[PDB]
Design a protein around this nucleic acid. Sequence first.
RNA 1: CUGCCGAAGUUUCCGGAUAGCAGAAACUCAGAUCAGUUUUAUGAGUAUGUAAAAUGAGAGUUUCUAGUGGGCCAUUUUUGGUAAGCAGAACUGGCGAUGCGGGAUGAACCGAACGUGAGGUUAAGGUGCCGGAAUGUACGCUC
RNA 2: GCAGAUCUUGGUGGAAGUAGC
RNA 3: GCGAAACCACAGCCUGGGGAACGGGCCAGGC
Lengths: 186, 124, 170, 125, 106
Amino acid sequence: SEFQKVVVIDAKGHLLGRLASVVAKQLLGGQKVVVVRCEELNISGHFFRNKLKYLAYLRAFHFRAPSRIFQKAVRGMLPHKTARGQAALEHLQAVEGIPPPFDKQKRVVVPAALRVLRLKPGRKYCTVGRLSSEVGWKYNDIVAKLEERRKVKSAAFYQAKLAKQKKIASAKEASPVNQKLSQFGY
Amino acid sequence: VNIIKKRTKPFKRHQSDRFKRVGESWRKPRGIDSCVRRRFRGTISMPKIGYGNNKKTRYCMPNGLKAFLVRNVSDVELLLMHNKTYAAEIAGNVSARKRVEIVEKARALGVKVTNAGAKVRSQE
Amino acid sequence: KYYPAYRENVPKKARKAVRPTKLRASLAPGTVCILLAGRFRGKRVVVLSQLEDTLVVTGPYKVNGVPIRRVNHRYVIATSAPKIDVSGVSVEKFTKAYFAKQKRSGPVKKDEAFFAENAPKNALPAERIADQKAVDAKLLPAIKAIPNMKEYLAASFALSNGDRPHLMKF
Amino acid sequence: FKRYVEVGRVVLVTKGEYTGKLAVIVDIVDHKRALIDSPCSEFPRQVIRYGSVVLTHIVMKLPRGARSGIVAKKWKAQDVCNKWASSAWAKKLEAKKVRSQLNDFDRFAVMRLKKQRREQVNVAV
Amino acid sequence: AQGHRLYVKAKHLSFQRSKHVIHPGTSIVKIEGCDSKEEAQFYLGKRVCYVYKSSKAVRGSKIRVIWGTIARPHGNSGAVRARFVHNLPAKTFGSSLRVMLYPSNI
RNA sequence: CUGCCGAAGUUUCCGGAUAGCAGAAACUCAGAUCAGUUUUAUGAGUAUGUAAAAUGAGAGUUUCUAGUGGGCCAUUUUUGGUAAGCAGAACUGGCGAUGCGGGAUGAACCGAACGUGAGGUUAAGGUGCCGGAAUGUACGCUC
RNA sequence: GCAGAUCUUGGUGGAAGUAGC
RNA sequence: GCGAAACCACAGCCUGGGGAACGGGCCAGGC
């Protein structure tokens, strides 16, 4: 449906293949896509299954960061040999965690890629950041530490916004104009 | 009545752009193992009678007229009755002494000239 | 000069007779409609009468400043706003010749404006303003009777974010 | 949980030509299909799949396999109508339905209306 | 603020192509906000344009427009087929477009 | 340079004379015949040939005159095989003179056989992304 | 009426300012 | 400082598959 000039996507609980396919199609549509929390990406299958899949890949440059793992999946779904697919890649920014510039921006999700809406209950799935922890990535511990720090600050902002929202909500019914002409569904 | 051209690009000889010794003028490819003769995908087109243009609009210039080569005033007078179908075209070897008299004669006859301003200047 | 000098192939007798245009059901006189194209795009105006093909339309002069103008019926969105009383204003004077562009004429002799370019200028006659001053006189009480009509026609229609023209009703 | 597939639960149809209507489960054909009915005349007794419906929180006392006439009488007796409407779910849906019909003039009157309500800002005044 | 925007935003996706053959005469246009072929029927026949800019200015204006018209829907997802007066360049894939509300039948 | 016709790639006797295939001319015919046709029935042994209903096409010549006078693959039939494979013949078409959509790609596979174009609709194959097209519906199976 | 004939004659290149003297 | 000649369709990263070699051109991947 409606689009935006730049899109920030929260990759928590999103399947790797499903999200990458939607992102790759959006990149070829000229949109600018920024994917945050790339280390919480989920892949269907046992963590043993993906460990050997990555270990087989280890046996070019074998990138270990979860963000570069996601970029590899997106890269394969683009015509990177041509200029059109080259420009699409430069319009994508995959990062782990939520950096400050995208910290205070709305983060949308893709229901077609969400694990809960796409994976059978009880199925074993592995987290990309957790999977990448035993392949060479050594920043998982600190990335989590900033994440809780960001969550505390984000929660404090939400309480301030919620407390402020209570003021307009209380004053919403105070004005008689709301009740007088609420026949329009508003 | 509008002139429709089935094609505007010329038919170049195959491999004419790789060699200077091979001219651009169209030559039918006689090679049996040639991809151009067998008309594969990506191979160039060849002159076929299907490309032939409408008989009514054949030989017609984009302005709707047919060129008529003129070497003197006597040639241009022939177009007295056919001035809405033909345009006078003075030959390249006709001197400027005769080009001016052809253009003045073609003006009274109501005949378009395709190259009326050649080898002359004006003096208002 | 008169006997045909050429073959002069006469056109074959065509069988395309001119029948009146069928306007839309919702393009009735007195409908508040949005102009889609032109210099007054987005302006809401009131339909006075339907011409042979176009709509003789006008926005009230003091409301949105849209003079009595022709608009093509394909370039108009007819909103479902309440109708305006237009039976009280005569519209017989609005013909094809009334809106027709004044003939480009003037026997300008050689030089002066022909060469020196001391050209004249155009100006709308008071006759057009006189007829215009009458229509808002017979229309302003009608739009004032119902609420928000004066403010409605003053505003200009626009599309906001998340507005789907196919879904939302006009 | 709060919602279970049981006889007498009021469900809301969300797919097909009966989208937005209300119905009550009468029989449990299978874990994928169920038989429903409604007191409304335009809604016939039919078998529908659970993918085309969402279960509301309203549960009403029905014997298994009740006919449409008995269901309609029980529906009126248990006052199911205007009880679902009392929920904020129906009010949100009804507001959405009324909003969809709104034309341009009503939208213009709304903008002026919400413009007046906005300037109140009587917080900390 | 609030601009004018008497049009609908749209994107140029690709040409009418098979796997290996392209037809630049027809372009596939995604009118964003339209999600099915039935919804696409509203926008059939509307005037679509590609507004771009060139560094050289003509008549004191640096904006150039290629006009087109939506012909028919394409697929089940509301994408439409548009034919322009000049075939759209291949480099305008993913570029924005403007779909007017005229000609109108509402 | 363009356009229109257009094979054969092999019977048979034996480098050949034939023939076949493809054209030219002159003849007589549409109330005459013909067919990689299907029948009916007679017989004969589910098939078989013959004779006489449907369907389609106007048919039969005579004369002389270019080229071919390799095969590959595939289908079916096949006889023995025999580490197992396979080999051997025969049967029949396609390619060999032929581009096009699909098949990742590919000459044998699936569709389709070609003047230059606009529009429409499909075949085979497809609709997550590369890629045009449902991250369609309804059941299940699979970790 | 030419693109071919390890074609004929003439001109001219890269190898190369190289091998080298 | 003086100064050739052989040779010269064009080119010049791999990995596979591509049945006829196919890798140097083709198809999917890396560079």
